[PDB]
Design an enzyme around this catalytic site. Structure first.
Site, PDB file in Angstrom:
ATOM      1  N   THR A   9      34.001  37.501  49.266  1.00  0.00           N
ATOM      2  CA  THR A   9      33.799  36.055  49.145  1.00  0.00           C
ATOM      3  C   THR A   9      34.459  35.555  47.863  1.00  0.00           C
ATOM      4  OG1 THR A   9      31.707  36.033  47.881  1.00  0.00           O
ATOM      5  CG2 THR A   9      31.530  36.301  50.284  1.00  0.00           C
ATOM      6  N   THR A  10      34.619  34.241  47.751  1.00  0.00           N
ATOM      7  CA  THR A  10      35.320  33.655  46.615  1.00  0.00           C
ATOM      8  C   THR A  10      34.368  33.501  45.435  1.00  0.00           C
ATOM      9  OG1 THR A  10      36.654  32.377  48.197  1.00  0.00           O
ATOM     10  CG2 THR A  10      36.850  31.779  45.869  1.00  0.00           C
TER      11      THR A  10
END
Ligand SMILES: [Mg+2]
Ligand SMILES: [Mg+2]
Ligand SMILES: [Mg+2]
Ligand SMILES: [Mg+2]
Ligand SMILES: [Mg+2]
Ligand SMILES: [Mg+2]
Ligand SMILES: [Mg+2]
Lengths: 249, 241, 196, 243, 195, 226, 204, 231, 244
Positions: free
Chosen positions: D30-31
């Site tokens: 995920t970012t």
């Protein structure tokens, strides 16, 4: 944690120890070095093949003092040689001088270096040393001597020999010229002649490294007043001292 | 083909993992050069900050190892900092045990021995770096000693390292062939720095702003790096003559 | 031994006598008890000479390595390293150390580490066998923010008295001044301070 | 070949392929981002809502080290936790000997040397995380990002994980549009927006935003989680900009 | 324990060792055999600290029996006594030394000679025509010094020993409950069963 | 034992007496107490003689290896640092009290070191049972900027004060002079003020005086051929 | 209880003209009790002689140890160890037990086979070397031996005069020591013959 | 494939195959369900027998008075991990007089599993766990995978066919979360959720294992006749 | 991890053989031939050096024959460096035994120890075996004159006459033809040199390519003497036995 606790050198079906053979090949590529034994001395010599001309090649010492009466030169991998010189200097103290209060005789220091090289050929997780050494020395009861040590740990005494690149030619050259009546200056002259053959470029005091085991040098002791202490027999010749002998060539 | 993966001999007596470590040494695409004055030792290195999100003050390949010794590294930064930390530990320990500052050449030898070990012991990999150590030594004077992944080292009158080391090297050789002395015959380190930058400009055929360089200077009893502004003042003096 | 360190307006000054005794014999009458662990972090040592030299050498090493990695250490950090050695090895050490240093943020600071390896930050500190005799004098005469000349006088008069009464203290009075301006060494001979 | 089968082996072009493969695990995560502001740093991360059954607010990802440092990472979450555990030991041992809390650059190198150590041997695997971390020390705010190779630098802003390209461009605009700097409060709002923007590359699932900060003026130089009203206000400001 | 004597005559070695075992206030036993056969022609008697005596003796016995099996060969009395000495010399610089003194009487089948070795707990070894440990020598050596001949028969050895034991029973304050006497010669080891 | 060290213009001088004792008995009348750590670093030792010899040899050995490793001449501060850290670790159980003097590329040096590992710096030092006698002479006659000849004079006078006044010291003076830019000169039995007077009588015996039970030849040769 | 005087005994060595002598008593006791009158304290490894006084278990251990080490020395060096070299080896070996020493007073005597020079040396229990030009003494009557040697000794005695001098030094020293005597041996050592003599003496 | 010989090797796409294979052992395991309200947390587990002569293998393990778990996969690995949890619960009680937070237990399990995924010679754990507890912040449910990922949930399922149970719980979420103060209703929703994962067989009296922990309820396990009520 | 590069030096083949032992034996078959012959009045050791050079310092050179103590010597076939490791170990065991028992080590006890050391390298540790076969010549007062060999497996056996190294098949056949039990040392000397003469891969057998030793009770009265022949003495015995 070093998890390579198994030998990296092993026997192949033909009985060969591959890694030792390959170490010997690395030595074969190395710059030529030689030694000659005279009646009153030994000379060891090699070429200072400088890696760039900006390199100060007097800061790279191929011929090394091991004890005041013992010196060494090599052909093969320089860094392997440098660490072996550190270990050899140390073992001369720890396994001899700190016990008997005197420096080891040449043959036993050779024996100790040889053992170190043998162990790199069988111990877990290491490769053999990629060098052959020529070790010249003097001691009271054996006189002057010259030994070769190979990557396997085998060592042999010589009257004169050569190792590295041009060794087959240099050994034939040495067989012609060697006799049991050479005086140290004769052996130096022969060393310089022999070494010229394997050298391409410049050939002078700044490109040749030459040392002798000869007479005691009281002038290099650093102190006076103990009659029995007469100075080291190992001496490295200067750039100038080599050039003087190159006119007499 | 496992003689290619670990530091054992190939059938020609070669150590491929060492050869490939030399290849990693140019992965940053940075060139560095070092020269000696009468009183000082100067090292310069290109500085490239290719990302605008970077804090450029933290981007460096020059290290202050001790008070007297500086180190520039050619190679990736993780291996560079590994070497820098170790060199700092060794220099401090040396002073504690032997009661005097570790010499530049002795530290180079020590780091070169450590490197030699990685080429002989299988469980350790070589570091993909070339280490150029500089100081003004109390016995030897201005000093440059450079180490590589083979565990080789030697002292230099001057030296260069990186993808374009050959151009810089030949440029430096040409100058010293002319001058016939082992150093830049200059009083002030400012001028030795200007010399160093000037000959890098000639040899690479490129110009530099103040943010394109990194400079380290060794004098008697200290090594320091220059700020962008000290470098600007250098560049200005070069242009005005 | 008589040692002290005193903070003042421009920084901190350390002072010491120069006598070390083996019983009643003065083994050294010109000892330097003011020891440098970093450029502007010094300490005065009391207790076993072997121990305090060993400790100071180790601290100097630690702060040299700290400097290489993290820049100039604070005086507090130096005191903490001293304390760590004194506290953890308290069974095997006889060491009473005063740490004094100059920062540009913090200016002059003084920490005393007595026998058990506790630490105490103070405006000034006194220690050594000679200090017992000048607790009253020092407490009456110390002021905060004295000038350099006043602080030199305070230390000189203080150690004067410690030396007068303590057989284990004597010789020259040495001082080290730590300010923004640098590091200054002072020395005062018996014929000066005995007449005070 | 076979150069990529064992960690710490140099390929003929001088590369460590196992480290490069670790980077793939990172790019798959995920970012996560960080923004260095005027007197502090802000950290934010996208948490994918894999299911309704995940208790909201309850699987916290950003981690504190000591009291003044925040850490966030993308890639293999357990690897990141292992790295933070080590960072906590390094911080404790630094504070124990030197008294002062560990400075951020000093802390950066501790993590860097440890991560780099895992590229020296074939008996270990590289870390499958990139880590963004920082906080406030005596010389001000510091933001760092550290990769599986052990490589780290200081940053103005940073991003990693799947939406890294989008976040970077957003981060670059901020650097250009504010040479004087961003307030901590502005940075929180901006961080919420950038995670919302970067969530395009991850649009399949919904997500939950998580933010933290350390600011000299706003948190007294301690690391705190952005919660309640201030969180909502940043979520709102983000919703607006994606609309 | 208390009295252990040995005498080497023409063709044999005789070891005499007291029978009492005393735990402070009570004589717990009056038939204790303070000896171990190490090999068919080698006997070792022992005295010293409780527990350690028998532990040491059985340890030595186990070792010599091991050697005998490994090599299918009986070590000479000299070789056994050197092995025992080294064990005691190593033990004296131990954390807790064996506090055990021994006599080794063996018949050397290769030289055809009886041999008697005296070794104390420090590893002090001596070969003797006769010997003892503790106070036994103080009462008996003046008699042995007088009557001993290197050509005595076994029976003359036993008679001289009887005289030694009689002097011990007269002048010694402790009741050691008589002695067990064993003879080591070319045919091995046997116990004189009335003394 | 009396040992001193004295700095002068261009160097440093150390000196010692030559008596070693076991309690009140003189074991050796011409002991050598000046030891070489390296060609130009010498030390004189008081205390347990085995320890002063052993610690001197060990650090001397390690100094020589250090010298080879660094391609530099050994420094007195290195000998000092290695000695003190070794002694400190053994907590005074190695009974070595030393005066360490020498010249090196850095200059000329004089230190003392005590068995527990403390060291000191000075222009003049004395150690041993005779050190109070020696120090009385040094405190009376020392001055700044001594010449070589003056320092040798002072050092041996100081040893003499120990020889005549301390029962623990006697026999001869040994000196070693270390001057900058020169070989260290070791002057064994520099002074010899205690030669025994001739005895009244010769005690040589008539041959056959001693009663002998047995003679034999002792074989000191290896097992012989044939 | 003092380990160096439980068993008793003495050794003395002297140099003469192109010779050395080394001698010892033959007593072994347990304090007041005489135990053996055949306990020789002089050993030799090639042409190098070693006398050892003190705790008898350590005398025997050290002889065995130095036989061990000089045998290996010989196999490797291909020559017999010399007195000077052996002296360093004894000193090294004793000092390695610095904090749990052998309770002995060793004495080395011999002639260097190359230089022909007579050599003697003594040691404390911890390896400190006393290398005397004249004589070395050791054991429970060492005070007495110092007294005898200091007045009887003169330099450059011929082997047959040295024998009388060293014998008389030993005998009369031993007779003033309760724990020494019960026989004595004297070695007279020249470059290529060694003669060993047992002396007649009082047996109390 | 060339990259699945050990746990210390990334594949070229950044995967860890030994870990993925460990995950596969859970998938072969018998189904187990977990869910909670605000007052209680429940485990339901379908136990597997070897044949008609054999016992049904137990799936639920008590870790402390306030905590326990159910397993799917390699049972000996569950024993190792639950033993570790018991010790950590115990340590917290003895040293700090403090009941170990369920969230903290999850972190400890993650870190223990992680170490077996990054070093030579180890293997990952081959078991999944659902951990329920009641602590100072109420009722909790955790899911553990041997990748080391630990997740806090209202409800979940693991093992063969766990997908049915899991979808059910996803629809029911708004109902079961509110079953406060009624242990029996929560268990029913649990038995209903697990039923969405049965085929061929149904829930019998030696088949079914239930555990519950909550407000005034020590972690207790029901087997045999004590589950007839819910069959 | 590291397993990948492990040769596994201590495994059986499917026929129940030890690969590395077999391959070490193959290595040893290219070493210079060494021969031991046992007579009633002593033992002979004779060995051929591997192709020399005129510049080799022979009189200070040892590559085949080594002293273990005064009563026991070995002849080496194989890797010289490996041999010296084992030789030094055997020298130490002999001194340990002498120290412990105050008797010289019996020949077989020494041989068994060295052989057990070799055996260990074939069963545990993952290291390569020693590439060495020994012939042991020695004397003790139990069995008198004895000959043994050991090889990289750690197996040892006793012999009246034996060879190791190159051409042992040919050498052994020749020894078996001419060996007789009542033979004396001077006869054994001749047999050994004649056998080397015939089996050598060299053109002729000269003194500079030999090492030679005898163990005789030709030391005066009940005692044993080892004699490592000097180069001149090898030259004389070649002439005297009429090979040159
Ligand atoms: Mg390697
Ligand atoms: Mg006073
Ligand atoms: Mg006894
Ligand atoms: Mg202490
Ligand atoms: Mg007497
Ligand atoms: Mg009497
Ligand atoms: Mg008597």
């Amino acid at each position: 944690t070093d998890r390579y606790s198994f030998s990296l050198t092993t026997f192949s079906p033909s009985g060969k120890l591959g890694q030792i053979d390959y170490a010997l090949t690395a030595v074969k590529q190395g710059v030529t070095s030689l030694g000659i034994k005279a009646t009153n001395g030994v000379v060891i010599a090699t070429e200072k093949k400088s890696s760039s001309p900006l390199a100060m090649s007097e800061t790279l010492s191929k011929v090394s003092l091991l004890t005041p009466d013992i010196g060494a030169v090599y052909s093969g991998m320089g860094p392997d040689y440098r660490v072996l010189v550190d270990k050899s200097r140390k073992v001369a103290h720890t396994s001899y001088k700190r016990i008997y209060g005197e420096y080891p005789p040449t043959k036993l220091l050779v024996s100790e270096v040889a053992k170190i090289m043998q162990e790199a050929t069988q111990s877990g997780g290491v490769r053999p040393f990629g060098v052959s050494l020529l070790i010249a020395g003097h001691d009271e009861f054996n006189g002057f001597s010259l030994y070769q040590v190979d990557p396997s740990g085998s060592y042999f005494p010589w009257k004169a020999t050569a190792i590295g690149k041009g060794s087959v030619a240099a050994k034939t050259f040495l067989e012609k010229r060697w006799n049991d009546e050479l005086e140290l200056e004769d052996a130096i002259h022969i060393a310089l002649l022999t070494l010229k053959e394997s050298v391409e470029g410049e050939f002078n005091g700044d490109t040749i490294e030459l040392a002798i085991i000869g007479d005691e040098n009281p002038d290099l002791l650093g102190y006076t007043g103990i009659p029995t202490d007469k100075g080291p027999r190992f001496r490295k010749l200067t750039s100038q001292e080599i050039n003087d002998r190159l006119e007499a060539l | 083909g496992y003689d290619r993966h670990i530091t054992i001999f190939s059938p020609e007596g070669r150590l491929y993992q060492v050869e490939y470590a030399f290849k990693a040494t140019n992965q940053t695409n940075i060139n560095s050069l070092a020269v000696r004055g009468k009183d000082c030792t100067v090292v310069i290195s290109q500085k490239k900050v290719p990302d605008k999100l970077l804090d450029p003050t933290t981007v460096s390949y020059i290290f202050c190892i001790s008070r007297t010794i500086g180190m520039v590294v050619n190679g990736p930064i993780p291996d560079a900092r590994n070497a820098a930390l170790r060199a700092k530990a060794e220099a401090a320990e040396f002073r504690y045990k032997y009661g005097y500052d570790m010499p530049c050449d002795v530290l180079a030898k020590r780091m070169a021995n450590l490197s030699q070990i990685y080429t002989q012991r299988a469980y350790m990999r070589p570091l993909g770096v070339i280490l150029t150590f500089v100081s003004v030594d109390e016995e030897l004077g201005p000093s440059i000693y450079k180490t590589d992944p083979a565990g080789y080292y030697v002292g230099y009158k001057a030296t260069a390292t990186g993808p374009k080391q050959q151009e810089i090297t030949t440029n430096l050789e040409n100058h010293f062939k002319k001058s016939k002395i082992d150093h830049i015959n200059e009083e002030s380190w400012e001028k030795v720095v200007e010399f160093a930058i000037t000959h890098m400009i000639d040899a690479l055929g490129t110009e530099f702003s103040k943010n394109d360089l990194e400079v380290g200077v060794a004098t008697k009893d200290k090594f320091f790096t220059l700020s962008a502004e000290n470098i600007e003042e250098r560049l200005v003096a070069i242009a005005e003559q | 031994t008589s040692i002290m360190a005193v903070t003042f307006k421009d920084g901190v000054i350390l002072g010491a006598d120069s006598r070390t005794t083996t019983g009643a014999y003065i083994a050294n009458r010109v000892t330097d008890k003011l020891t440098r662990v970093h450029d502007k972090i010094w300490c005065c040592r009391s207790g076993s000479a072997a121990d305090t030299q060993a400790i100071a050498d180790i601290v100097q090493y630690h702060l040299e390595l700290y400097t290489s990695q993290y820049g100039t250490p604070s005086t507090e950090t130096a005191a903490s390293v001293f304390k760590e050695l004194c506290y953890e090895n308290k069974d095997n050490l006889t060491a009473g150390i005063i740490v004094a240093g100059y920062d540009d943020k913090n200016k002059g600071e003084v920490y005393t580490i007595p026998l058990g390896g506790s630490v105490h930050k103070l405006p000034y500190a006194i220690a050594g066998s000679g200090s017992t005799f000048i607790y009253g004098y020092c407490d009456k005469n110390f002021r905060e923010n004295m000038s350099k000349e006043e602080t030199v006088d305070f230390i000189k008069h203080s150690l004067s008295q410690a030396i007068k009464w303590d057989g284990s203290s004597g010789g020259v009075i040495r001082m080290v001044v730590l300010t923004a301006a640098g590091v200054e060494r002072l020395i005062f001979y018996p014929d000066e301070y005995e007449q005070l | 070949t076979g150069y990529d089968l064992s960690n710490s082996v140099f390929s003929p072009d001088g590369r460590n392929f196992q480290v490069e493969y670790a980077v793939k695990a990172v790019e798959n995560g995920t970012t996560s981002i960080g923004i260095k502001c005027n007197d502090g740093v802000v950290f934010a991360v996208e948490k994918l809502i894999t299911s309704k059954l995940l208790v909201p607010q309850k699987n916290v990802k950003i981690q504190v080290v000591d009291r003044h440092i925040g850490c966030v990472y993308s890639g293999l979450i357990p690897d990141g936790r292992h790295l933070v555990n080590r960072g906590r030991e390094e911080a404790a041992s630094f504070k124990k000997l030197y008294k002062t809390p560990i400075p951020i650059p000093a802390f950066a190198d501790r993590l860097g040397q440890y991560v780099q150590a895992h590229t020296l041997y074939n008996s270990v695997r590289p870390f499958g995380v990139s880590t963004i971390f920082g906080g406030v020390d005596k010389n001000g705010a510091h933001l760092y990002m550290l990769e599986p190779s052990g490589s780290y630098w200081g940053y103005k802003g940073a991003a990693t994980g799947k939406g890294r390209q989008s976040a970077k461009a957003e981060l670059e605009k901020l650097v250009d549009h504010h040479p004087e700097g961003l307030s901590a409060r502005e940075a929180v709002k901006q961080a919420a927006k950038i995670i919302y923007l970067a969530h395009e590359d991850n649009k399949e699932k919904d997500f939950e935003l998580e933010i933290s900060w350390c600011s000299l003026s706003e948190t007294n130089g301690l690391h705190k989680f952005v919660k309640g009203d201030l969180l909502q206000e940043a979520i709102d400001f983000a919703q607006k900009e994606i609309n | 324990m208390d009295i252990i004597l040995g005498i080497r005559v023409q063709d044999s070695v005789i070891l005499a060792s007291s029978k009492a075992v005393t735990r402070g206030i009570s004589v717990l036993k009056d038939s204790d055999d303070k000896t171990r056969q190490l090999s068919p022609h080698t006997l070792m008697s022992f005295a010293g600290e409780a527990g350690d005596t028998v532990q040491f003796a059985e340890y030595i016995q186990a070792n010599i029996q091991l050697y005998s099996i490994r090599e299918d060969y009986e070590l000479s009395p000299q070789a056994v006594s050197s092995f025992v000495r080294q064990e005691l010399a190593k033990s004296i610089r131990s954390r807790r030394p064996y506090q055990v003194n021994v006599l080794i009487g063996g018949y050397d089948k290769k030289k055809n000679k009886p041999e008697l070795y005296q070794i104390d707990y420090l590893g002090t070894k001596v070969e003797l025509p006769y010997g003892a440990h503790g106070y036994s020598g103080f009462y008996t050596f003046s008699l042995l010094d007088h009557h001993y001949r290197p050509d005595m028969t076994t029976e003359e050895g036993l008679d001289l020993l009887k005289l030694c034991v009689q002097e011990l029973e007269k002048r010694m304050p402790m009741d050691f409950k008589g002695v067990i006497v064993k003879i080591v010669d070319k045919d091995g080891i046997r116990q004189v069963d009335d003394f | 034992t009396t040992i001193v060290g004295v700095k002068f213009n261009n160097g440093v001088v150390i000196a010692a007496d030559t008596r070693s004792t076991q309690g009140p008995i003189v074991a050796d009348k011409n002991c050598a107490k000046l030891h070489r750590i390296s060609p130009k670093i010498w030390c004189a030792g008081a205390g347990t003689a085995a320890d002063t010899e052993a610690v001197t040899q060990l650090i001397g050995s390690n100094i020589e290896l250090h010298s080879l490793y660094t391609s530099r001449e050994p420094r007195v501060v290195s000998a000092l640092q290695m000695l003190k850290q070794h002694l400190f670790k053994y907590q005074g159980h190695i009974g070595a009290y030393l005066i360490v003097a020498g010249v090196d590329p850095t200059g000329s040096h004089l230190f003392s070191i005590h068995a527990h590992g403390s060291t000191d710096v000075g222009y003049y030092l004395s150690l041993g049972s005779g050190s109070l006698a020696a120090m009385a002479v040094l405190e009376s006659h020392w001055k700044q900027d001594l010449t070589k000849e003056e320092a040798i004079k002072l050092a041996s006078d100081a040893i003499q004060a120990g020889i005549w006044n301390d029962l623990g010291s006697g026999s001869n003076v040994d000196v070693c002079v270390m001057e900058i830019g020169k070989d260290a000169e070791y002057l064994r039995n520099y002074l010899t003020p205690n030669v025994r007077e001739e005895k009244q009588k010769s005690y040589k015996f008539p041959r056959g005086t001693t009663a002998v039970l047995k003679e034999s030849i002792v074989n000191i040769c290896d097992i012989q051929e044939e | 209880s003092d380990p160096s005087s439980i068993n008793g005994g003495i050794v003395v060595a002297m140099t003469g003209k192109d010779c050395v002598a080394i001698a010892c008593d033959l007593r072994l006791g347990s304090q007041s009790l005489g135990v053996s009158n055949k306990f020789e304290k002089i050993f030799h490894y090639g042409h190098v002689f070693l006398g050892i006084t003190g705790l008898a278990t350590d005398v025997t251990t050290l002889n065995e140890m130095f036989r061990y080490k000089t045998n290996l020395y010989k196999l490797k060096e291909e020559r017999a160890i010399e007195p000077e070299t052996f002296t360093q080896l004894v000193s090294s070996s004793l000092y390695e037990r610095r904090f749990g020493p052998y309770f002995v007073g060793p004495v080395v005597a011999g002639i260097n086979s190359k230089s022909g020079k007579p050599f003697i040396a003594g040691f404390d229990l911890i390896g400190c070397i006393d290398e005397a030009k004249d004589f070395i003494v050791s054991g429970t009557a060492s005070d007495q031996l110092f007294g005898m040697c200091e007045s009887l000794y003169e330099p450059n005695l011929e082997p047959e005069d040295l024998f009388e001098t060293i014998s008389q030094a030993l005998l009369n020293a031993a007779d003033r020591d309760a724990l020494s005597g019960w026989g004595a041996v004297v070695y007279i050592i020249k470059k290529d013959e060694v003669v060993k003599r047992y002396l007649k003496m009082r047996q109390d | 494939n060339n990259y699945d010989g050990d746990t210390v090797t990334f594949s070229p796409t950044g995967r860890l195959f030994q870990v993925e294979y460990a995950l596969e052992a859970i998938k072969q395991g018998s189904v187990t369900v977990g869910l909670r309200s605000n007052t209680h947390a429940v485990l339901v587990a379908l136990k597997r027998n070897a044949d008609e002569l054999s016992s049904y293998q137990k799936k639920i393990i008590k870790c402390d008075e306030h905590m326990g778990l159910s397993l799917a996969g390699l049972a000996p690995d569950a024993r190792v991990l639950s033993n570790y949890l018991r010790q950590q619960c115990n340590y917290s009680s003895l040293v700090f007089n403090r009941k170990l937070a369920v969230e903290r237990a999850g972190h400890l399990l993650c870190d223990k599993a992680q170490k077996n995924t990054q070093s030579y010679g180890g293997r990952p754990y081959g078991v999944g766990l659902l951990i329920i507890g009641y602590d100072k912040s109420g009722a909790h449910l955790l899911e553990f995978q041997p990748s080391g990922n630990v997740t806090e949930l209202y409800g979940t399922a693991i093992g063969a066919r766990s997908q049915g149970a899991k979808t059910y719980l996803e629809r029911t979420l708004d109902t079961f979360i509110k079953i406060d103060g009624n242990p029996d209703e929560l268990i029913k929703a649990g038995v209903e959720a697990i039923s969405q994962s049965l085929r061929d067989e149904s829930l019998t009296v030696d088949n079914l294992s239930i555990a519950i922990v909550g407000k005034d309820t020590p972690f207790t396990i029901y087997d045999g006749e004590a589950v007839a009520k819910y069959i | 991890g590291s397993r990948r590069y492990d040769s596994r030096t201590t495994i059986f083949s499917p026929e129940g053989r030890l690969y590395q032992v077999e391959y070490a034996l193959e290595s040893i078959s290219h070493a210079g031939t060494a021969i031991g012959i046992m007579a009633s009045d002593g033992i002979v050791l004779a060995a051929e050096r591997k192709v020399t050079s005129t510049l080799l310092e022979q009189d200070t050179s040892t590559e085949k024959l080594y002293k273990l103590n005064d009563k026991i010597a070995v002849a080496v076939a194989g890797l010289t460096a490996d041999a010296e490791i084992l030789i030094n170990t055997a020298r130490i065991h002999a001194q340990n035994y002498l120290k412990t028992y105050n008797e010289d080590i019996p020949v077989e006890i020494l041989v068994r120890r060295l052989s057990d050391i070799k055996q260990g390298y074939t069963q545990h540790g993952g290291l390569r075996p020693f590439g060495v076969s020994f012939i042991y010549a020695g004397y003790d007062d139990r069995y008198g004159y004895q000959l043994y060999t050991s090889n990289p497996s750690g197996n040892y056996t006793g012999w009246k006459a034996i060879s190791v190294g190159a051409n042992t098949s040919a050498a052994q056949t020749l020894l078996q033809m001419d060996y007789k039990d009542d033979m004396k040392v001077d006869d054994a000397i001749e047999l050994a040199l004649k056998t080397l003469s015939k089996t050598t891969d060299s053109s002729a057998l000269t003194y500079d390519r030999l090492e030679f030793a005898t163990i005789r009770k030709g030391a005066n009265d009940g005692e044993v003497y080892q004699k490592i022949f000097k180069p001149q003495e090898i030259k004389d015995i070649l002439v005297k036995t009429g090979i040159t």
